[PDB]
């Protein structure tokens, strides 16, 4: 009596045939096991509920009991729910970097995450290096990037350059990355992107006591209040260290400071659902904040090592390959000179 489910990661598609009593947890486990992700703490299963709200699957309940939009298969998006503080320090596996890279690039390209042009071109140069490998004047002739969406729409139509003049600027940078591993360009992409003001921020529309409209931001470090007009710079910052507790009562959402003699900050949200979603994200972000500031578990040390073994194997498999190619590129230089 199996229900069919489709799970789409940022670059792969999975079908499972679950039982009707299968938990989110059990499905999640089959997913990360299928693609060899062990850094599971960052990720979740996203879906559309019966009213078209995009919703995180709850791992401790039956999949079928969570108001999933009815169709065969059920459709989930495997996505990053949480972002590390430093991609260099905390993204261990190749799979993990790639899914983060792809999810963040989508956000940059569709203008969800704001990016100045120069930085946009620079990020575009690292994506090109990952997709096309070392630039090559033979293979990469003019307009070899013509069929590629490399910049955000906002960059394209507020600057006078044409798409070829953008492509040319991205090419200069692509030449400088010659010798960069595909995977090492992914990380450089992430090292630039993780510094942007809007990277790793979940915003919700809120109103203050008075009633002035605002945004709330929740990220790995805490909560922020932004003006309606400006989601780049916080008005005030609420880092975990400076917060006693965080509470909702229906539409009312409250931040109580550490300083018992300091007054509480109070906000209202359009619905209870928004307030549940906000508190869950704070809980999840705070949980990983605290874990980040504790020695690697034994498990994590083994992932760090398993990761190191596998990259070495790949490094050698790329040298063994490159060695046989230079035998063949020569074996033609020999037969080309015997002719001439």
């Amino acid at each position: 009596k199996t229900i069919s489910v489709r799970v789409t990661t940022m670059d792969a598609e999975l079908e499972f045939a679950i039982q009707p009593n299968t938990t989110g947890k059990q499905l999640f486990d089959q997913v990360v096991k299928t693609i060899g992700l062990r850094e599971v703490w960052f990720f979740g299963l996203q879906y559309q509920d019966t009213k078209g709200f995009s919703t995180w699957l709850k791992l401790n309940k039956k999949v079928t009991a969570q108001d999933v939009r009815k169709e065969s298969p059920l459709l989930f998006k495997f996505r990053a729910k949480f972002y590390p503080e430093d991609v260099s320090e905390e993204l261990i596996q190749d799979i993990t970097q790639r899914l983060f890279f792809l999810q963040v690039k989508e956000g940059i390209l569709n203008d969800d995450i704001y990016c100045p042009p120069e930085t946009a071109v620079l990020l575009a140069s690292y994506a090109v290096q990952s997709k096309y490998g070392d630039f090559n004047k033979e293979v990469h002739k003019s307009g070899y990037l013509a069929g590629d969406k490399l910049l955000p729409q906002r960059v394209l139509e507020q600057h006078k350059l044409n798409k070829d003049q953008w492509e040319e600027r991205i090419q200069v940078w692509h030449e400088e990355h010659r010798g960069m591993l595909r995977e090492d360009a992914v990380l450089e992409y992430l090292k630039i992107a993780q510094d942007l003001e809007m990277y790793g921020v979940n915003y919700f529309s809120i109103k203050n006591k008075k009633g002035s409209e605002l945004w709330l931001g929740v990220d790995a470090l805490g909560l922020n209040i932004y003006e309606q007009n400006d989601r780049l710079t916080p008005k005030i910052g609420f880092p975990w260290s400076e917060i006693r507790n965080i509470s909702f009562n229906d539409k009312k959402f409250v931040i109580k400071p550490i300083d018992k003699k300091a007054p509480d900050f109070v906000f209202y949200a359009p619905r209870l659902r928004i307030n549940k979603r906000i508190l869950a994200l704070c809980m999840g972000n705070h949980e990983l904040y605290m874990r980040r500031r504790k020695p690697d578990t034994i498990e994590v040390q083994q992932m760090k090592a398993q990761a190191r073994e596998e990259k070495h194997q790949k490094q050698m498999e790329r040298a063994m390959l490159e060695n046989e190619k230079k035998k063949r590129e020569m074996a033609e230089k020999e037969k080309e000179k015997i002719e001439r």
Partner: peptide
């Protein structure tokens, strides 16, 4: 409905 998250 109410809920409290202790941060500190």
């Amino acid at each position: 409905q109410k809920k409290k998250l202790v941060i500190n």
